[PDB]
């Protein structure tokens, strides 16, 4: 019973980062070396555990979070980082144990004239807690006057589109990201081979 990583990595559509997707992986055998040996990933960084030596471990649950951000923001998907993504969209904890995997998706997620389907949260009063997911679309009140659902001065729609275009420089190009979190509380459900 092998873990369904193909459902996550090879999904046709990926979430916007503010509405990041979480897949629970359990009661299966995972071979992580097939991922680490791929050459298709420009980021493959593990925290707490080592990249190799991964198939000898067991956990109660593995989570696979996934979303699209721009290339200049992939560095924010790491413990201890700050920025619009880490602060307002997707936050890893300081004590994160897991792996962050990313790859350029310009050929899938950019469009001539701009792909505007991918959004991020631009306005938020306070930083997210780790693994918090805020899907509110309430108008952001930047002054003392209530917005009453109308955009305008000091009254901002909180999400912004990336608008990926294929001619973007690499830092503005879309990257697909998968965050694997390794949870252990209860009998272990997800183990390496044999």
């Amino acid at each position, epitope marked *: 019973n092998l873990c369904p990583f193909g459902e996550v990595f090879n999904a046709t559509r990926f979430a916007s980062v503010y509405a990041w997707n979480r897949k629970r992986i359990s009661n299966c055998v995972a071979d992580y070396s097939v991922l680490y040996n791929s050459a298709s990933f420009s980021t493959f960084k593990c925290y707490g555990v080592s990249p190799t030596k991964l198939n000898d471990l067991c956990f109660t649950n593995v989570y696979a979070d996934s979303f699209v951000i721009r290339g*200049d923001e992939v560095r924010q998907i790491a413990p201890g980082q*700050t*920025g*619009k993504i880490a*602060d*307002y969209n997707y936050k890893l904890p300081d004590d994160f144990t897991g792996c962050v995997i990313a790859w350029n998706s310009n050929n899938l997620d950019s469009k001539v004239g*701009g792909n505007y389907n991918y959004l991020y949260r631009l*306005f*938020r*009063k*306070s*930083n997210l807690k780790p693994f918090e997911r805020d899907i509110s679309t309430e108008i952001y*009140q*930047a*002054g*003392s006057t209530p917005c009453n659902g109308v955009e305008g*001065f*000091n009254c*901002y729609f909180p999400l912004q589109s990336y*608008g*990926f*275009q294929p*001619t*973007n*420089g*690499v*830092g*503005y190009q879309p990257y697909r990201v998968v965050v694997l979190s390794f949870e252990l509380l209860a009998p272990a459900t997800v183990c390496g081979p044999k």
Partner: antibody, heavy 116, light 110 residues
Framework: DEVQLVESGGGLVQPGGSLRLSCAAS????????MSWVRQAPGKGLEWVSV???????YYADSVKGRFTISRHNSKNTLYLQMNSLRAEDTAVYYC?????????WGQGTTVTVSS | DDIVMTQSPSFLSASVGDRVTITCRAS??????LAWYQQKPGKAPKLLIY???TLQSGVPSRFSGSGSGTEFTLTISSLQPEDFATYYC??????????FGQGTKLEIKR
């Protein structure tokens, strides 16, 4: 209330000295906004200096990293720039600005001169 | 490598009533992440355009922005006396942050 940013604190400093700039805001809430300092040396263009996010993250231009600190005081609705280890090339008019979709509100500027 | 914003020309002369075009070129594609400002001597900059082509509230309709990718333009359709000034483009959400063009000074032709 009228929308405005009112800066103060500019003056003459020796190289290696320190200065604190202030920017009192009206008509929006400093702690809810992307607030920046932007400077302009004599006869030159605009140069961004530092930003503070509503959630508290701060960033700095490479030319001022380790020397300048941006901060705010929510009850006074005021932004600050603490400038240490000043150098002659820091001589400029310093502006504070609010960024929403571009920097739509700007202070009047305060002049900082660094010289022996 | 950091993206560089190059404005041209550095000085431009025109007459009241002229159509004027100011250009900003990005060293790599930046989509519509661009703002334009006007600044007069001794005064703070004023925002004219954001998202490359969206006119800022209260700015006269003779100002327009266009472009996407690496070439952006600010057009003043019929220049007025109060429009002689310096203009700056600014890269939005850039790394490093808030890169400005070096400015175009619009002066009176004679």
């Amino acid at each position: 209330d009228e929308v405005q940013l009112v800066e103060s604190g500019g003056g003459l400093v020796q190289p290696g000295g320190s200065l604190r700039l202030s920017c009192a805001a009206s008509g929006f809430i400093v702690s809810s906004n992307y607030m920046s300092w932007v400077r302009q040396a004599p006869g030159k263009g605009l140069e961004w200096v530092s930003v503070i996010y509503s959630g508290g993250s701060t960033y700095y231009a490479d030319s001022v990293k380790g020397r300048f600190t941006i901060s705010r005081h929510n009850s006074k609705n005021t932004l600050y720039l603490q400038m240490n280890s000043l150098r002659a090339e820091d001589t400029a008019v310093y502006y504070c600005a609010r960024e929403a979709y571009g920097m739509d509100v700007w202070g009047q500027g305060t002049t900082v001169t660094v010289s022996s | 490598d950091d993206i560089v914003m190059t404005q041209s020309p550095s000085f431009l002369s025109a007459s009241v009533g002229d159509r004027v075009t100011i250009t900003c070129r990005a060293s790599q594609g930046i989509s519509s992440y661009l703002a334009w400002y006007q600044q007069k001597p001794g005064k703070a900059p004023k925002l004219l355009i954001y998202a490359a082509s969206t006119l800022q509230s209260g700015v006269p309709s003779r100002f327009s922005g266009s472009g996407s990718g690496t070439e952006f333009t600010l057009t003043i359709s019929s220049l007025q006396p109060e429009d002689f000034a310096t203009y700056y483009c600014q890269q939005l959400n850039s790394y490093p942050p808030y890169t400005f063009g070096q400015g175009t000074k619009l002066e009176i032709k004679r």
